[PDB]
Ligand binder design. Sequence first.
Ligand SMILES: Cc1ncc(CO)c(C=O)c1O
Ligand SMILES: Cc1ncc(CO)c(C=O)c1O
Ligand SMILES: Cc1ncc(CO)c(C=O)c1O
Ligand SMILES: Cc1ncc(CO)c(C=O)c1O
Ligand SMILES: Cc1ncc(CO)c(C=O)c1O
Ligand SMILES: Cc1ncc(CO)c(C=O)c1O
Ligand SMILES: [Cl-]
Ligand SMILES: [Cl-]
Ligand SMILES: [Cl-]
Ligand SMILES: [Cl-]
Lengths: 286, 290, 290, 289, 287, 290
Amino acid sequence: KVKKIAAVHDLSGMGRVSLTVVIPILSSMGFQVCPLPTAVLSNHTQYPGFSFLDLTDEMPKIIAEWKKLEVQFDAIYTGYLGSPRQIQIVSDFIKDFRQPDSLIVADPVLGDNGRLYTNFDMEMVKEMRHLITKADVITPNLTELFYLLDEPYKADSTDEELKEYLRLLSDKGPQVVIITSVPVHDEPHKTSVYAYNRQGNRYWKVTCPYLPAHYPGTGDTFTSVITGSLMQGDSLPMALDRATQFILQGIRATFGYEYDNREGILLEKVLHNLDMPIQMASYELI
Amino acid sequence: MYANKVKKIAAVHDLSGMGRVSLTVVIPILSSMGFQVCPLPTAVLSNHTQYPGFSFLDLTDEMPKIIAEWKKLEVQFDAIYTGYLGSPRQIQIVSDFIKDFRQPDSLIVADPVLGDNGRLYTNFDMEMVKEMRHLITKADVITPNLTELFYLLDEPYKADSTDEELKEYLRLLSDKGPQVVIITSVPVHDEPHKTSVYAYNRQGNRYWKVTCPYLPAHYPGTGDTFTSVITGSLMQGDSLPMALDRATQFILQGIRATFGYEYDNREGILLEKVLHNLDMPIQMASYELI
Amino acid sequence: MYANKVKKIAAVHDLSGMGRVSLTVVIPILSSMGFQVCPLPTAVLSNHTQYPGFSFLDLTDEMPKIIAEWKKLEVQFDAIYTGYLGSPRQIQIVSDFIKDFRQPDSLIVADPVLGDNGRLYTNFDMEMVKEMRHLITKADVITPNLTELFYLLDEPYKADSTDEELKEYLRLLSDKGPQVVIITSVPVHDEPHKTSVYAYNRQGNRYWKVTCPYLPAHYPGTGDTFTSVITGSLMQGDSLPMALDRATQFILQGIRATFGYEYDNREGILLEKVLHNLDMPIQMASYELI
Amino acid sequence: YANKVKKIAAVHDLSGMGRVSLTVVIPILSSMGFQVCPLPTAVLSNHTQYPGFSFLDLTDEMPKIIAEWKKLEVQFDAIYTGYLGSPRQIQIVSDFIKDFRQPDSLIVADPVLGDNGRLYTNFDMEMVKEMRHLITKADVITPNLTELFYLLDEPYKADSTDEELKEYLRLLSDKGPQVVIITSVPVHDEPHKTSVYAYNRQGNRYWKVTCPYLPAHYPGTGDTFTSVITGSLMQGDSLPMALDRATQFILQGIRATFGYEYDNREGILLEKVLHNLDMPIQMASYELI
Amino acid sequence: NKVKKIAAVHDLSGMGRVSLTVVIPILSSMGFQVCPLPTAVLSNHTQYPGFSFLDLTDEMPKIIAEWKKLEVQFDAIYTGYLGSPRQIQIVSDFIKDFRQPDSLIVADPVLGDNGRLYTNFDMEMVKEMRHLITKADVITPNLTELFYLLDEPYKADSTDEELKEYLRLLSDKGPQVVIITSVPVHDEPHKTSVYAYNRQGNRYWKVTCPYLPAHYPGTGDTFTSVITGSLMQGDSLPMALDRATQFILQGIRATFGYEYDNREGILLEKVLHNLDMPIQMASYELI
Amino acid sequence: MYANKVKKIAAVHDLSGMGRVSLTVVIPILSSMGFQVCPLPTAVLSNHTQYPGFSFLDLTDEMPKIIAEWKKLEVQFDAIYTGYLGSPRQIQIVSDFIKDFRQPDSLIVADPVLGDNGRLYTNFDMEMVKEMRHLITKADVITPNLTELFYLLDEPYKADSTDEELKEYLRLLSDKGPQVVIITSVPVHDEPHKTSVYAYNRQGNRYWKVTCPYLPAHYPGTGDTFTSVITGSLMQGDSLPMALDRATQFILQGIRATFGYEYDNREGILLEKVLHNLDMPIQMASYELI
Ligand SMILES: Cc1ncc(CO)c(C=O)c1O
Ligand SMILES: Cc1ncc(CO)c(C=O)c1O
Ligand SMILES: Cc1ncc(CO)c(C=O)c1O
Ligand SMILES: Cc1ncc(CO)c(C=O)c1O
Ligand SMILES: Cc1ncc(CO)c(C=O)c1O
Ligand SMILES: Cc1ncc(CO)c(C=O)c1O
Ligand SMILES: [Cl-]
Ligand SMILES: [Cl-]
Ligand SMILES: [Cl-]
Ligand SMILES: [Cl-]
């Protein structure tokens, strides 16, 4: 038996976002990914244009059959949703498919660089605020964090402010809260990730020398690796390390020739480096 | 100076939630072999069609919209690999896509997904067979199972054809276009737990055979697994006999991994448990038919 | 349709019987990494020149004869990788070889083999140094050790340069031709059991450093092992920092394999003992100097 | 305790193009875990089955290398000879074997002289005459069928019986080598196939294996063969196990060349199959009782 | 996260490669945990002229009692060389008490070879072994053991039809699957053969192999070990015959070409990694 | 000519029916690594002693009978590897066995099996500890856990030693005999779910450390798995740091294979699921304390 993950994400043909990242990563990590597609696109929405087909009306039809099949899922991992209407459907899906040992992961995909993704609006943000209440683990980037808390984007927070924000989000329900893409004061070529585990009341941080917002889909890569790592039995900080190192390699793999960063990290090139432990701890308790 | 990029494969297959078929097999296998899979989805299903029931959304109308964007982006594919299509109307779309995106060094692979166990898949009819006969004329490599071979040739299904009769069929299909033709799921003489594969390569005029101690028809999607491995193996520069070896070894490990406990075979081979074996040394399996 | 051949590397190095230097390192490493190595031998020796004595046969006058046959065969190289040369006359022969055999996608790698530990290798003098200064202008990637760096820049050897000064040396050398410059065997302040490697890529204008707990100068031919892994890794499409990690980790393993018994370090790293680890997942240690 | 990296002195030429001699011996034996220490016999641009080649005879340098090796006190676990640069090298290489063999050394001689019933380019009966001496100093010899007849001093015969083949093996073994292996034996009525025959004086056993390739089509196939045999033996494998590893590795390398325009003069695609050397093998060799 | 467990009811012998020192490495290598119920401790196998011997008859019920306290469950029970005739009742009760509906019960009815009982065995061990085999699903007598089990005189030359009969006569006693090893091959003194019957589908199989297993002590233990593992992995009976015979052939050939004391057994550890790969050329035949 | 046969290891451990300890771990591991394991059984037990109970048969009186037969056979062992002993009287038996069967090139490995979690194993007392102190003087490699270390040194258990203190413990034991001392199960400050291993080699004077994200004491028998891998790695000619890396990575894998479902940790690591990883390339983990 191979554990099954219901992945509630869009399918985009080009760019490395959503299902075309989730599927390869989590399959490589030993988990069967069962897609519940939210939308179909030619490519991600950080290109100038894209085709877009909303799958809101098909999703209950898929779920209906999954019930008929009596499929059990070990995890439900959500990301980019096709319409605000889908939060209700997904939230009911989690309600009806959760099990005592389910892992529920929500990447609250709303935007990056201080801005909502194309065509998203406050209806999506308000609904997503509900969706996170169903999850065990959430992975907002800094843009999403402030949309979720209904505050304005602020790039420069203290570590204590960041720990407050982590607690505020955990109070909405999730035991594990992870904030990605946090600027590093007076280090403009670095990013950091902050995490909180309610169980044991622990806070972590990792500094990593890349800028994920240059590469669409890095949140999907990050959260995919976090999901598989936790499901394999790694600790939260171990998971942070695996995810951040994997993304670092994927980003570095694009260096030294002309590259259109919109195509994403070079996933397939570095995919086999997931198959190893990180023999150097980079994480710290804060 | 030198560069050695990640190659892109356009994958023209459905997306199914449960079962291990189509994009949920093509994506993981080919990504693991080092290729970016770019999906051109043909349909969305709850699960594959050999379950008693399934949801279904035909993506025929969305396809040209995706393709027109890919033209805008100026994406170039090193290979196009087709399988399960959502309507007979898609054949013209996919044919035009192949025509407009193929490069001189492109690999075009068509798994002519029509049926298995001697019958068409749920809701497939002769119009889909008819159109599939045209699509395969566009491909460099085709991978019919035995049910599909007979539909392609417009002949009745026979489960006891001779070896030279099979070479005959391989040539007949090759003459319609494909340099490489592979026939999967050929029943065996006296061995009801075994199956076989036959192949022909117009380049060098060679014929191959492999014998397999498994019955792939018992596991929905094993043709998607087979052709994915074939496609990555050929793209890595392996010879046809090596590609046959890798595809059949992989499938064998995938099936044997289900043994030992109650298993619902409709869920497919245990892909994720054997996916890292794609890297390993491959035992020679195929042999030349002289 | 797909053609993806075994790439060929012309290896312009000596053949030494004992010790692990030059062709007896380049051939096994690059073959293991999937490349055919085609030797253009610069000299024949019984063993490397860091032993007290050695036989030596200069092959300068055979090299044009070999090049001439290669032209008649119409052989094409995907890369040209140079190292220890057998006389000062070879620099111009080799420069012409690169001129005539390079392609638009070629990778020209020159390890400017001149000396180590602050001294030239036995029988090298300033003529070899002055000529090598010319040859590096023709390369895409050069891999001097710290000694060779100061000989190339015509400045006195200095063991305590800053990161800032190493960045300036990298840039001065890149200004002479090479898009990628790697300086090996840099001492680490207050850490005498360690070595660092520094690199610059003019494309993207990035600087890298990696620190390792080994002393490469204790094991003759470690520059050949280093440069062979760098060449293979770049030809496989790895990024520069990934090449640096692969090369340094392989060498560390090769050094670690000699520990715990009486070993004559002049024999080199235990190459055969670690060769099958070239393939494996790597965790990154290289970091960007911003 | 220690279990070190064994060293093999490889007495072969260095050719730039084609997959023959040192450019085959070095990568195969290294991948199998042995340090190869070349004693080069000649330098060529390419193997001699191309229309032309450069050639530098290294006869005068070999004694200079051997002299340094004595001063270094280097010890070899094996000495593996193949293509030699002049008939004068037999004496040099024989004296090298005599002076560096230890009681447990493995001496392997591929008596490289020709193929397809003809001597290689510029070889003549002087090389054959001297090769007849060299084989008597070896523990293992690997002639192809052409070389077999030159060594025995009989006319080439394409169609011998298995019993005649057992006779030839025994006749060669009686000249010195415990193990005699004849490659490239035609298979009656199967023109797409080849066979290998072998004898081991230790245990008095005879082996045959039949394979679906034609090694003569790929220059250097004897060098791949004997390299894998040498490695297999040095790892402790039995003779029939070595015959199987060698023939299977070659078939994989030839199979790697199919289905695209390939210049077979370039050899088997060594790099493409090199990582298969160490995997489990099913045996096809069988004993001729 | 589960590995199937096999109770191995065999002796522990220091030197030679018999019994637990073959069963443990082979089955572990095939993915199963081997849990020993040791029948005896010896310095070496009993085809050497001398050996130490400690009978564990009295210890085995103590071990079984503890296994019941631990609530251990076995996927297979695989018996071989036993330390006294008294052990047969102990082992029968053990199978009775630990068999589950999906259990695979394998008995190698270890009694002798080369037409002779092993040292110190007599007709009491034979008589009890005839009982023990009635409890098994798969049995693997050599030809010597076959005739002892049948209470008929050893005969080196039987037709294939007699052999089919011998196979039925044993299946009648209980076992679904009966395999006879070390059968001579008429006119081929350097070969051996293995004959098998499956009451299911009523199928008879033969495989000829060019080795003489009686020259190497423990080849029965190797053979039955590989059969057990191969059956538990889901191979057919004939596939299992091929794997086991091929593995032994390699182990035997691994000893050729130098001074070797055959009493040390096949070179198991040398060829062990060849179990990891399927036989590509089947060599069994339906008879 | 070349002969290169199967090396034999005398394994002086108990045979336990259930649990993964002693001979039922030494035999599969070393056999898989290419070695013949010849057991000298110390005791027969139903199961290891960390279960709620066990049957126990002391083989002290049988061991001389076995040894006398082995002398008669003229058997020679390449290594002797000792672990759990059945009574204090066995140390003299075993010491005499090592004296009489060691050859100049033998490897003598002693796992000084006494206890864990700061307690002696069931029915062990100070007589066992005192005799074990003698036995380790005869070994080349010893592998105490931290509890065993303090018993061997006759000091009270303590959880928080500095690295300087651990290096001193390593010298104290190594100087009494063993060229190689390895201390396992050392707690990691502030990391309660991690463990550490420390080692010293007299040949080269190097001190090593490795940190692992597992708790070996949760899985009875992990010391036998550890020492078995150390033993086989060294006998294959690996260096000490490569042995440490292989042993720790094997145990990590074996522990991680138990995650995700209800598991009875008393059964040990999932040995058979990871046994085939032993021949994979392994990551460097161990590093020098300078
Ligand atoms: C379709 C689509 N899916 C997912 C993402 C990021 O998770 C993006 C981010 O740009 C997107 O456009
Ligand atoms: C939806 C769907 N897609 C693909 C396949 C087989 O290629 C099947 C086979 O059952 C299917 O149902
Ligand atoms: C002949 C010869 N060749 C190569 C090297 C180092 O690349 C050395 C370094 O000593 C040498 O002496
Ligand atoms: C130079 C050279 N060396 C070796 C060989 C064959 O081992 C040949 C076969 O043609 C050759 O030409
Ligand atoms: C003790 C012991 N155990 C088992 C066997 C053969 O299964 C033999 C065969 O001789 C033996 O002596
Ligand atoms: C019998 C027996 N043998 C060995 C060990 C651990 O090495 C233990 C640890 O509990 C044990 O109880
Ligand atoms: Cl770079
Ligand atoms: Cl060390
Ligand atoms: Cl082909
Ligand atoms: Cl032999």
